[PDB]
Structures are given as C-alpha cells and as structure tokens.
C-alpha cells in the first residue's frame, strides 16, 4: 500500500496539470 | 409581591438572612411570569443593548430559585438555575452582579455534582466565574471539594464539615456527601477480607457504629452483627484463575470463520 | 435546475419553484452519482479478474 | 410555453436522467456480473 | 508591471482547478486530488509567491481574473486584499495585480473547465455554481490572517462561506469540503463569542443525504473549535460522541481533528481515550509547513499520555529543537516521578504563563492527582506487598490514611489496581501469572486479529485506486 | 453573545401555560443553531404541537420537526411537518429546513410506486400536505403547454392521474404517444405498469383527428389489440383524406403478421372506405 502511494504522490502533479490539455486535444482528433 | 428589577427586589432579601419567608416569594412569582414573556423576546441575539431588560429577566427567577432551595426541591431550582446562567453569557459573564445570586452559583456547583453529571459540572466550572467577584465564603465548598476530589485526598474534601456554614447549602452538601460515602463503601468490599467495625467506621466516612449497620447492609456487607466483606473480597484477588473452557472460548468458530473468508 | 447555489425569491416557479424542482431531480440524479463512485470500483477489478482469467484460462 | 421558461428545463432535464438509468443499470450488473 | 504577478499566479491555480473540478464531477478520483491538494498546493502558493516582484502574494489573481463575478464573498475578500472600491486591510499593487484597473492580463486564455472571467459573467446557467465559488472562496480565506486583515473579513467567511454551498451534489461538496478546511485554520486563531453554529449544523445534515463523505469531515472540526472558543465544555461533548469520523478527507484535517478532540476529552479526566488520540495527531502531521502547529501538540501530548499513570519519554521533549519551551514539561514529568507535590504545585505556576498560552493549563490542574498516584502504581507493581507507612514517606503524602485513598478511588478504574488489607495494613498485589493454562489468550488475540482484519480488506481496496486514476487521466 | 439554549429548555418545562406558549415562536430561528442542547427538551415541544390547548401547533410542529433531523431521524420529523400541514412556502424561503423538503420528495415516491401502479388515484397513505406538494410541480406543467414533463414524473412515480386526459388541464395533444412508447419498454420492468401505460395510449389516439401513425403499430403487435390500430381508420373515414391513410398502413403491416392482417382488413369496411 506504501510504495504505490509513494510513486503516486511524485506522479499526482504531472498527471493532473497534463490532463487539461489532452483532453481539448482529444475531442478535436476523434472527429477525423 | 409583583417582582422585576429597577422597581423591585424586595422579595429576594424579604426571603432568607432577615426572616424565614417563601409564602410571598414563591407563592406570587406567577404573576412574575407575565413581564418574563416581555423580556425572554430580546435576548435571542446577545448584545450589551439587551441589558437593560435582562437584569429585569434575572430578578424573578433569582427569587424563584431561592424560594426553591429553602423548600429542599431540588428540580424547582434547577429550572431557575438554568435561566440565569445563559443570561450571564451575552459576552460570557455580561451579569456576574447581586449578592441573590452568589448562593445560587456555588449551589449550581454542588448540585451538577451530586447527580454525578461530570460534562456539565466542568461547563459552569468555566462558564461562571464570579467566585472572588461575590468572594469565597459559600461559593468556596465546591471550590476546595474540586481540587481535593481530584487530588484524591479525601481526607481533605472539606464537605463533611461544610454543612456547619450554610446559606440554606446544608441539603445540597448532603446529597453531595451520601454520593462520596457510596463510592468509598462498595470498593471497601473488594478490599480486605473481615475487619474491626471500629475500622469500618473509619475510612467508611461515618460517624458511628450505628450509621455503619445500617449502611453497609443495603450494600451487602455487614448483613448481621458481624463483618461480611469477606464474600466480594475473594473474587477479585485471582484473576488468572478461571477455566468454563468452552464457554470461556467465547466461540472459536466465529473468529475463525471471520478469518477465512478473505483468502 | 439552471443553478445550485441559493438565489431567487418564492413564486412556485422563483425559490420555492427551483427548490422543489431540485428535490424532483435528485432522486433521479442519485442513480447516475452512485455510478460515477461505482467506475473506480469496477475498473480495479476488471484489472485483476482480466490477469486472472487470461492464467486459468491459458 | 414553446419559448423557453423554467418548466421546460425541468422536462430536459428529466428525459435525459431517466433515460439514461436503465443503461446505467447494466454497468452496475458487470460490478456484481 | 511585473511579469511574475500574472503569469505564475493565475497559472499555478488554473491547473489544479480544472483538474480536480472535472475529473470529480466525472469519476471518484478522490485519492488522487487529495495528495495533489496539501502538499503542493498550499506550500508553493504560501512560500514562493511572497517575494516575487511584489508585496506578498498567494493566489488572489485566479479571485480576480477566472473570478467569473460569482455571488461568492470571493469577490468581497477580493475588495480587501486589492482596492476596487475599498482600499481594505492591504494595498494594492500597481505591478499588474490590479483590481482598481480589472481586465489587464492573461495567459490562460479560452477553456470552459479552466475558468476564464471575461468568457462568461456568470456561472447561474448550470449545477457548476456551488463548485467553483467554493473554489475561489478557498483561495481567499488562507490568506486573510497571513497578510494581517482583521475585522469584518474574518466573520463573512465564517457565516457566509456556509451559505454559498449548502445545497450541493456529490462534486460540488467535494470541492467546498476543501474549502471548508482552510477557512478551519483562520478559525482556531481568534475566539468568537459570536455564533457561527446555526448555518454549520442545518447544511451537515443536508449533505449527507446529497452524498459526500469529506464535507461532513471538515465541518466536524471546524464545530470542535467553535466550543473551544465558548469554552463551554457541554457542547463539544456531544459533538464528539456522536461522531466516530469516517476517512475520506485528507491527511493534514485528520490532524487537527484529533488534537482538537483530544484536547478536550482528558479535562474529565478520560485520559485514557484522549491519549490515543493525541500520539495519532503528532504522526499524521506534515513535515516542515506543519512545524508551529506541531510544536502546540507536542506540550498538549506529554501532558496527556502523562495524564494516563505513564511518565512519557525525556528524550522527546529534547529532540524537536523547541526544547526550550518543552523543558517546563520535562519537570512536570520529573515530579510525576519522584512524587513529591512541592516541585510539581511550583513549577505549575511559574511555567503557568507559559502554559496558557498553549491551552494546555486546564489539563495541567488535572496532573497534580498524578503525582502521587503513577508512584504507588509503580511502587505496587514492582514489589506486591508492601506496608501503608512505606507508601506515605516516598511520596511524600500525610499519612497511611492517605494512600488508601488514593488506592481507593483508582481501583474501581482499574489504574493502580491493587487492593488495601487492613489486617495489618498493606497494600496488596492483585498479580498472578500463568496464563497459557487457561483459555484467556486466545480471546487476546482473536480481538487483534478481527480489529486488523477489517483494516485488510481495506488495505486491498484501497492501493489500487490511485495509480488507476492516474492512468484514466489524460497524459502527455 | 449568547451561545447557551439554557434558558428556552426552562420555559418549555415550566408550569406556566403562558411561557410554553410564547417559547415556540421564539424558537424558530435558533433551533438550528442551539439544537443540540434543545434535543434534551425534544418531548415538551412535542407534547404542545400534540395539544389542542394551543394554537401554537403549526408553530411548534416546525421546531419539533427541526430538532429531529438534525437528531440523524429524519422521517418522523417530516411526519410532525406533515400532520400540522404547515406551509411549504416558508420552509423554501429559508436554507435551514432544505432537509425537510428533500426527504418529502423522495419519500412521497416510495408510498407512491405501490398505491398507483394500478389504480388512477395514488390513494390514503399519501396524506394532503403531500399532494400539496405535488400540485405546486402539477401547476408548472399546465403552463408550460406540454405533456413530456408530466410524462416523465407520472412513469417514475407510476401514476395515472397526469399520464392521461391532462389536455383537459391542457397539455399538448400531439406528438404525446411517441415519447410514452419508447421511455416506457426501455425504463420500465414491471408489465402491471407497463400495460397500463399502453391501455392508456389507446384512449389518447381518440382525442386527436388525425393521432400518429407510427405509434398505433406498436400497440397492434404486442397486446394483439385490434383496438389500437382501430381509432386511427375511425378517424381517417371522417377526415377523407388518401395521403394521410397511405402512411398509417405501410407502417403497420411491417410490424403485423399473417394473423393481424387478417383481423384490421374486417375492421376498416365496418368503419367505411
């Protein structure tokens, strides 16, 4: 339970911040 | 008489320390209550605005509570008690004032106590502190009982001898002392074995061999004329000895069961 | 719903009219919450019935 | 009416919840399934 | 100008907003947000953004410009923190923070789920309302006692910050919960006869039916406090009977409801419960931005595993690096020890400026029965049989009378746990051994094992969940 | 400021008819904040809503009420609210007493599944204030000028008191039967129900001179009904009209088989060419 939430609490920001941006870029690419 | 502050008080001194009186200070506090609905209609939010109609509030059941306490009913008293307390907190002790309230606040303390209620006894412990503005002479019983009872010196207590002085306290410092004797005199059993009576008069706060007959039988020890701690005595002293087995197993099969499931 | 903070005042169709409405709505919107908590669930074990399945099966 | 009041948004939103649960329902089977 | 002002403050928040807002709305990601929220947001924001370019700086340019105008007191918080019609409690900046002038710069740009202000005037069009005026309020009641404001500010957060989400679903609550929780460290800071409670309680029951776990936490502490203030000891009694505290909501809360909690319990003398309580909260505490709320437990904490007959460890109270502050509580635990009353009704009062300050001192009246009664507990222990005489010259107590007493109320407890024989006058042992004959052990155990197995299940179910989160979010 | 009930539990206590009176109204705003202490003195409250001495009750009812949810039992304090019949109205205006409205409408689903899955009313067990509830939604969709929001309501609920004749309360007549066909197979696992649903749209089609002609098919094929394909050729006869009769018979012979075929044919020369 401790080494998977170690490895989550260095990735949490990366993800998160990232999210926003695929997203937009996912709805355009899906039409084509 | 018709009571409510700034024209009247006359009842609160008229009551006790000039002459025993409640057959005008409690028998006519029912018109009292018709001017109270007036003035409970403004202390719903709590500013220093509402004081003037607030004091006025306090005066009845100042004498309400007073009349209550000489007559040894307890639930009457209560009642009044409440009302003044929360009247006191409109920026925490707004009213600490009248020398008709000093007596009610020790009693409060006594008697949060004697039903054994420890949340609210430590609630106006804090809440009410005006025990040097109306200064220690019977507000000090509680005072000096709570550092003693906690402390765990008994001897110390200061409540088998704090019915002497007495504003009309002595009932209340009563029921309080029969509580502290109850607690001493079921653990006694457990104790020792079959002691001297004079002994079981000693640390059993009583004060005679007499009182002790009496009071001991209803608890289950000293049935007759001789000394029966010896029954619950015995049972408490080997702990690591007791085997039902499978009764005192207390059902392998559920734990076990409980267990399993997971994997 | 076209709000869910507190706003408007009673015509039964002002706060009264969309406090009603939102009581109407979330007997039908509890369903679809429990749901979206219940994905978290489902996923982890699909995971673990996926890598389960494809051993006993092989 | 036909123009766009208050009940007209409680008709959308409606429609959508309540056709949408009987689909959610087969997603809360493959949980339990 | 100054080019730090925008790009960093409104950038920072944006993220983190967006994220967190649509992905809970979405799914149960709840883990996830949880760890992102305490650690990285509070410490860049506070830390960092002070000195930049300009005086101070936490985030009140997201509450400025993806501010959207809500009905929020976000914007009246706003008012103060710049200058828009009221100078308030701190002075604007003319570096490119301003209020007085609103629609300078942007670099977040169009995004719905980012927040834009000048996109859209209002947010009363959808359910999003409660959410992200929750979220801008948020970023504002930090803030507020860092920078100095007083007064008027403090009170419509307190209030107010109740009746902007009261009415809410399981995403919007989820948002508040947070919301909620920062306004609780403003809270404990300054007393309030004031009552605050009305709106607190009404919105608790309501939300719990909407759905959401983490807002029924935070509202549990923030409750805890508000007795605290009055100093009432009945209300907060109820308050926590009632509750047993569920564990979505995160880490750095968790804290403060302990403490909060603990604190209050061993007044009545249930040391006991109140310990547990305390040695969780120091543990469950961040690192070095926790530090000045984690020194206040660390006096609370001596004083309550004290409280219990134990004499709590010397090293501890020297480790810290607030030894100083921690060696009044060293000496009470020196004159818990010996036994004697003279060093320890001394020490109370001379340190007792010390210890108010912490809010410690109601407690610490309470240790005096202590003294004596952790000295024949570990007189007793030792050596069974022992003569009343002997009791009464260790610690220094009146007579043989004395002691008994002591033995007298603890035993009913079970404390000291021995009994007093006066066939010649002793005190006795209970103790026996041997226990492996008799079928005691089995229950010992059977109760460690039921109270881990459940943990087990959720040790399971829990580990899983955020990594999938992670991988259900969109990465680069 | 005044944080303590203290005083309010006297009153209530007290021998004084007059001071138990007044202490209701008083009540009202605190009981929300104070509530916890005031639990202790839930029964006075209680006994003076229950009392016919006072006129208070209505009064009284609402702080009872109040005291119960906060409590964690929110059912009998919605069952004190009901009983006065005190006006939603103010419970609406306030953000205090939103518990109260929430558990009224989701319990007033419960009794109402069971009373109206086959009967038109909704019967006894769903009590005036209720229905009072209801009436204020039941406004709403009159106005409105359209039948899917009552629709939609009357299936989750399952009655049968706004899922026909409601064009009589005014609703829209036309496009009514689409809607009803295709929520109702998809949501709906209960047939009682279902039936119903269907028997109803037989008696829609007649209201309408020209009803529509995809949904009379459906209605043909799965309850073996020569009723429903029947109003649509009674209407057609009357109207005259080639164009309008065309659509109506390719869509249902799709659908039919052999054995419909035979029993419509009978029925269109009994109403006329």
Request: aromatic share 10%; hydrophobic share 40%.
């Given at each position: 339970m401790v080494v998977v939430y170690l490895a989550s609490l260095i990735r949490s920001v990366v993800a998160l911040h990232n999210l926003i941006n695929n997203k937009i870029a996912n709805r355009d690419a899906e039409k084509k | 008489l018709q009571a409510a502050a700034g024209m009247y008080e006359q009842l609160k001194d008229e009551w006790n320390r000039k002459s025993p009186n409640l057959s005008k200070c409690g028998e006519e506090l029912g018109r009292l209550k018709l001017v109270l609905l007036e003035l409970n209609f403004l202390p719903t939010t709590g500013t220093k605005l509402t004081k003037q109609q607030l004091i006025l509030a306090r005066d009845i059941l100042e004498i309400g509570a007073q009349w209550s306490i000489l007559c040894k009913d307890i639930p009457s008293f209560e009642r009044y008690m409440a009302q003044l307390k929360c009247y006191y907190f409109?920026?925490?002790?707004?009213l600490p004032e009248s020398a008709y309230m000093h007596q009610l606040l020790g009693l409060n303390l006594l008697f949060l106590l004697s039903q054994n209620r420890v949340a609210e006894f430590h609630t106006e412990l804090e809440r009410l502190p005006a025990k040097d503005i109306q200064t220690?002479?019977?507000?000090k019983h509680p005072v000096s009982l709570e550092q003693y009872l906690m402390e765990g010196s008994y001897n110390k207590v200061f409540l088998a001898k704090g019915?002497?002085?007495?504003e009309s306290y002595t009932f209340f410092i009563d029921i309080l002392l029969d509580t502290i004797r109850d607690e001493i005199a079921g653990c006694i059993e457990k104790a020792?074995?079959?002691?001297?009576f004079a002994e079981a008069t000693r640390i059993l706060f009583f004060s005679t061999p007499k009182k002790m007959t009496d009071y001991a039988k209803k608890r289950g020890?000293?049935?007759?004329?001789?000394?029966?701690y010896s029954f619950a005595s015995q049972?408490?002293?080997?702990?690591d000895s007791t085997i039902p087995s499978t009764e005192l197993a207390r059902q392998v099969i559920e734990y076990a069961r409980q267990l399993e499931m997971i994997v | 719903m076209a709000l869910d903070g507190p706003e408007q005042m009673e015509l039964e169709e002002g706060k009264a009219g969309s406090g009603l409405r939102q009581y109407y709505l979330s007997k039908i919107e509890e369903l679809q919450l429990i749901v979206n908590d219940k994905s978290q669930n489902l996923r982890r074990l699909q995971a673990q019935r996926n890598e389960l399945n494809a051993k006993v099966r092989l | 009416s036909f123009l766009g009041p208050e009940p007209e948004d409680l008709e959308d939103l409606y429609s959508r919840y309540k056709k949408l649960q009987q689909e959610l329902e087969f997603l809360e089977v493959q949980e339990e399934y | 100008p100054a080019p730090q002002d925008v790009e960093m403050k409104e950038e920072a928040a944006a993220g983190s907003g967006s994220a967190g807002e649509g992905d809970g709305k979405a799914a149960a990601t709840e883990h996830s947000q949880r760890e992102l929220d305490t650690v990285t947001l509070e410490d860049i924001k506070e830390?960092?953004?002070?000195?930049?370019?300009?005086?101070?700086?936490?985030?009140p340019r997201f509450v400025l410009?993806?501010?959207?105008?809500?009905?929020?007191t976000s914007r009246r918080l706003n008012h103060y923190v710049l200058y828009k019609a009221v100078h308030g409690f701190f002075t604007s900046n003319?570096?490119?923070?301003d209020f007085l002038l609103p629609f300078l710069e942007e670099p977040?740009?169009?995004?719905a789920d980012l927040q834009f202000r000048?996109?859209?005037?209002?947010?009363?069009?959808?359910?999003?309302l409660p959410e992200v005026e929750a979220y801008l309020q948020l970023l504002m009641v930090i803030f507020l006692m860092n920078s100095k404001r007083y007064k008027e500010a403090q009170k419509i957060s307190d209030d107010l910050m109740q009746k902007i989400?009261?009415?809410?679903?399981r995403a919007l609550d989820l948002v508040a919960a947070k919301c909620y929780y920062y306004h609780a460290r403003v809270y404990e800071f300054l007393d309030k006869?004031?009552?605050?409670?009305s709106f607190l309680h009404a919105r608790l029951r309501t939300a719990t039916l909407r759905h959401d776990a983490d807002g029924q936490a935070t509202l549990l502490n923030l409750l805890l406090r508000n007795y605290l203030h009055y100093s009432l000891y009945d209300q907060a009694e109820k308050l926590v009977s009632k509750s047993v505290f569920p564990?979505?909501?995160?880490n750095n809360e968790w804290a403060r409801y302990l403490y909060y909690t603990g604190r209050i319990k061993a007044?009545?003398?249930?040391y006991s419960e109140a310990r547990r309580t305390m040695t969780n909260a120091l543990r469950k505490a961040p690192q070095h931005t926790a530090v000045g709320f984690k020194q206040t437990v660390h006096k609370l904490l001596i004083v309550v595993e004290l409280l219990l007959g134990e004499i709590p460890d010397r090293l501890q109270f020297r480790q810290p690096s607030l030894k100083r502050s921690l060696m009044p509580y060293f000496l009470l635990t020196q004159a818990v020890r010996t036994g004697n009353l003279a060093k320890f009704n001394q020490v109370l009062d001379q340190f007792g400026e010390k210890f108010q300050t912490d809010g410690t001192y109601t407690l610490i009246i309470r240790l005096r029965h202590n003294v004596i009664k952790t000295g024949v507990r570990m007189i007793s222990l030792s050596y069974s049989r022992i003569s009343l005489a002997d009791i009464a010259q260790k610690l220094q107590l009146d007579s043989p009378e004395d002691a008994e007493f002591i033995v007298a109320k603890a035993i009913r407890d079970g404390v000291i746990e021995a009994s007093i024989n006066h066939e010649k006058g002793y005190v006795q042992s209970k103790e026996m051994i041997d226990?492996?004959?008799?079928?005691?052990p089995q229950l010992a155990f059977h109760q460690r094992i039921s109270f881990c197995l459940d943990i087990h299940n959720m040790s399971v179910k829990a580990m899983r969940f955020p990594p999938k989160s992670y991988n259900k979010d969109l990465e680069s | 400021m005044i944080t303590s009930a203290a005083g309010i539990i006297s009153l209530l206590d007290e021998e004084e008819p007059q001071l138990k009176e007044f202490a209701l109204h008083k009540l009202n705003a605190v009981v929300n904040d104070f509530w916890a202490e005031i639990s202790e003195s839930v029964d006075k409250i209680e006994v003076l809503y229950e009392?016919?001495?006072?006129?208070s009750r209505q009064f009284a009812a609402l702080v009872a009420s109040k005291v119960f949810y906060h409590l964690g039992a929110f059912e009998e304090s919605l069952n004190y609210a009901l009983g006065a019949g005190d006006l939603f109205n103010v419970n609406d205006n306030?953000?205090?007493?939103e518990t109260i409205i929430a558990k009224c409408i989701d319990h007033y689903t419960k009794q109402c599944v069971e009373n109206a899955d086959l009967p038109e009313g909704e019967k006894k067990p769903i009590d005036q204030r209720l229905e009072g509830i209801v009436n204020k939604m039941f406004q709403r969709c009159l106005d409105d000028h359209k039948y899917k929001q009552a629709i939609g309501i009357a299936l989750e609920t399952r009655r049968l008191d706004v899922f026909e004749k409601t064009i009589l309360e005014?609703?829209?007549?036309?496009?009514?039967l689409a809607y009803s066909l295709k929520l109702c197979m998809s949501l709906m696992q209960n047939k009682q129900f279902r039936n119903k649903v269907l028997r109803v749209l037989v008696k829609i089609?007649?209201?309408?001179?020209?009803?529509?002609?995809?949904?009379?098919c459906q209605c043909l094929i799965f309850l073996?009904?020569?009723?429903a394909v029947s109003d649509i050729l009674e209407k057609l006869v009357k109207e005259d009209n080639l164009l309008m009769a065309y659509q109506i018979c390719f869509d249902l012979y799709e659908s039919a088989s052999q054995q419909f075929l035979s029993s419509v044919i009978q029925n269109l020369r009994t109403v006329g060419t």
């Amino acid at each position: 339970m401790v080494v998977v939430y170690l490895a989550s609490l260095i990735r949490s920001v990366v993800a998160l911040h990232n999210l926003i941006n695929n997203k937009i870029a996912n709805r355009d690419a899906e039409k084509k | 008489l018709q009571a409510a502050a700034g024209m009247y008080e006359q009842l609160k001194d008229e009551w006790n320390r000039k002459s025993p009186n409640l057959s005008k200070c409690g028998e006519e506090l029912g018109r009292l209550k018709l001017v109270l609905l007036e003035l409970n209609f403004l202390p719903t939010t709590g500013t220093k605005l509402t004081k003037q109609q607030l004091i006025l509030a306090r005066d009845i059941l100042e004498i309400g509570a007073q009349w209550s306490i000489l007559c040894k009913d307890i639930p009457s008293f209560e009642r009044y008690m409440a009302q003044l307390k929360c009247y006191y907190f409109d920026y925490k002790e707004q009213l600490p004032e009248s020398a008709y309230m000093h007596q009610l606040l020790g009693l409060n303390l006594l008697f949060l106590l004697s039903q054994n209620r420890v949340a609210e006894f430590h609630t106006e412990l804090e809440r009410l502190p005006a025990k040097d503005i109306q200064t220690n002479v019977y507000i000090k019983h509680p005072v000096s009982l709570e550092q003693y009872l906690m402390e765990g010196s008994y001897n110390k207590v200061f409540l088998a001898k704090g019915n002497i002085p007495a504003e009309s306290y002595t009932f209340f410092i009563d029921i309080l002392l029969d509580t502290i004797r109850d607690e001493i005199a079921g653990c006694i059993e457990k104790a020792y074995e079959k002691i001297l009576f004079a002994e079981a008069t000693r640390i059993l706060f009583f004060s005679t061999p007499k009182k002790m007959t009496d009071y001991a039988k209803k608890r289950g020890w000293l049935l007759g004329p001789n000394n029966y701690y010896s029954f619950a005595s015995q049972q408490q002293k080997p702990e690591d000895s007791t085997i039902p087995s499978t009764e005192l197993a207390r059902q392998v099969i559920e734990y076990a069961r409980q267990l399993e499931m997971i994997v | 719903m076209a709000l869910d903070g507190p706003e408007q005042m009673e015509l039964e169709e002002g706060k009264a009219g969309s406090g009603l409405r939102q009581y109407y709505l979330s007997k039908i919107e509890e369903l679809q919450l429990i749901v979206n908590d219940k994905s978290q669930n489902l996923r982890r074990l699909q995971a673990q019935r996926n890598e389960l399945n494809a051993k006993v099966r092989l | 009416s036909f123009l766009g009041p208050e009940p007209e948004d409680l008709e959308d939103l409606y429609s959508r919840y309540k056709k949408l649960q009987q689909e959610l329902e087969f997603l809360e089977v493959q949980e339990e399934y | 100008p100054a080019p730090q002002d925008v790009e960093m403050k409104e950038e920072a928040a944006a993220g983190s907003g967006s994220a967190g807002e649509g992905d809970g709305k979405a799914a149960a990601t709840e883990h996830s947000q949880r760890e992102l929220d305490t650690v990285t947001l509070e410490d860049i924001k506070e830390h960092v953004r002070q000195l930049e370019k300009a005086v101070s700086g936490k985030e009140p340019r997201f509450v400025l410009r993806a501010l959207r105008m809500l009905p929020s007191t976000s914007r009246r918080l706003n008012h103060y923190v710049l200058y828009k019609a009221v100078h308030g409690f701190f002075t604007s900046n003319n570096a490119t923070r301003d209020f007085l002038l609103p629609f300078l710069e942007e670099p977040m740009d169009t995004e719905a789920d980012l927040q834009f202000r000048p996109r859209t005037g209002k947010a009363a069009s959808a359910p999003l309302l409660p959410e992200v005026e929750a979220y801008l309020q948020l970023l504002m009641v930090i803030f507020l006692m860092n920078s100095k404001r007083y007064k008027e500010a403090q009170k419509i957060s307190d209030d107010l910050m109740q009746k902007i989400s009261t009415q809410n679903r399981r995403a919007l609550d989820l948002v508040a919960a947070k919301c909620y929780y920062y306004h609780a460290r403003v809270y404990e800071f300054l007393d309030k006869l004031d009552v605050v409670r009305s709106f607190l309680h009404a919105r608790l029951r309501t939300a719990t039916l909407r759905h959401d776990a983490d807002g029924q936490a935070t509202l549990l502490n923030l409750l805890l406090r508000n007795y605290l203030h009055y100093s009432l000891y009945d209300q907060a009694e109820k308050l926590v009977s009632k509750s047993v505290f569920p564990e979505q909501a995160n880490n750095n809360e968790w804290a403060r409801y302990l403490y909060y909690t603990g604190r209050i319990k061993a007044i009545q003398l249930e040391y006991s419960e109140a310990r547990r309580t305390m040695t969780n909260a120091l543990r469950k505490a961040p690192q070095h931005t926790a530090v000045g709320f984690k020194q206040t437990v660390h006096k609370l904490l001596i004083v309550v595993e004290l409280l219990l007959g134990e004499i709590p460890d010397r090293l501890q109270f020297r480790q810290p690096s607030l030894k100083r502050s921690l060696m009044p509580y060293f000496l009470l635990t020196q004159a818990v020890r010996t036994g004697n009353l003279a060093k320890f009704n001394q020490v109370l009062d001379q340190f007792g400026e010390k210890f108010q300050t912490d809010g410690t001192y109601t407690l610490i009246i309470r240790l005096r029965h202590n003294v004596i009664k952790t000295g024949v507990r570990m007189i007793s222990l030792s050596y069974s049989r022992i003569s009343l005489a002997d009791i009464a010259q260790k610690l220094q107590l009146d007579s043989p009378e004395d002691a008994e007493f002591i033995v007298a109320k603890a035993i009913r407890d079970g404390v000291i746990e021995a009994s007093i024989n006066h066939e010649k006058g002793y005190v006795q042992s209970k103790e026996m051994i041997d226990i492996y004959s008799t079928r005691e052990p089995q229950l010992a155990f059977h109760q460690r094992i039921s109270f881990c197995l459940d943990i087990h299940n959720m040790s399971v179910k829990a580990m899983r969940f955020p990594p999938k989160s992670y991988n259900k979010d969109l990465e680069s | 400021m005044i944080t303590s009930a203290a005083g309010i539990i006297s009153l209530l206590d007290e021998e004084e008819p007059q001071l138990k009176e007044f202490a209701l109204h008083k009540l009202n705003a605190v009981v929300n904040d104070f509530w916890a202490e005031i639990s202790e003195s839930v029964d006075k409250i209680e006994v003076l809503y229950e009392d016919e001495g006072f006129r208070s009750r209505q009064f009284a009812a609402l702080v009872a009420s109040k005291v119960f949810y906060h409590l964690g039992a929110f059912e009998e304090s919605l069952n004190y609210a009901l009983g006065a019949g005190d006006l939603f109205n103010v419970n609406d205006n306030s953000e205090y007493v939103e518990t109260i409205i929430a558990k009224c409408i989701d319990h007033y689903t419960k009794q109402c599944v069971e009373n109206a899955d086959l009967p038109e009313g909704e019967k006894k067990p769903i009590d005036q204030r209720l229905e009072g509830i209801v009436n204020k939604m039941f406004q709403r969709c009159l106005d409105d000028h359209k039948y899917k929001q009552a629709i939609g309501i009357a299936l989750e609920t399952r009655r049968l008191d706004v899922f026909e004749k409601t064009i009589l309360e005014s609703n829209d007549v036309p496009g009514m039967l689409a809607y009803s066909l295709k929520l109702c197979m998809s949501l709906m696992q209960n047939k009682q129900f279902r039936n119903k649903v269907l028997r109803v749209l037989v008696k829609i089609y007649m209201n309408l001179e020209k009803p529509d002609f995809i949904n009379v098919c459906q209605c043909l094929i799965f309850l073996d009904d020569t009723q429903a394909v029947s109003d649509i050729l009674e209407k057609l006869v009357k109207e005259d009209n080639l164009l309008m009769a065309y659509q109506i018979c390719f869509d249902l012979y799709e659908s039919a088989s052999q054995q419909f075929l035979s029993s419509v044919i009978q029925n269109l020369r009994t109403v006329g060419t």
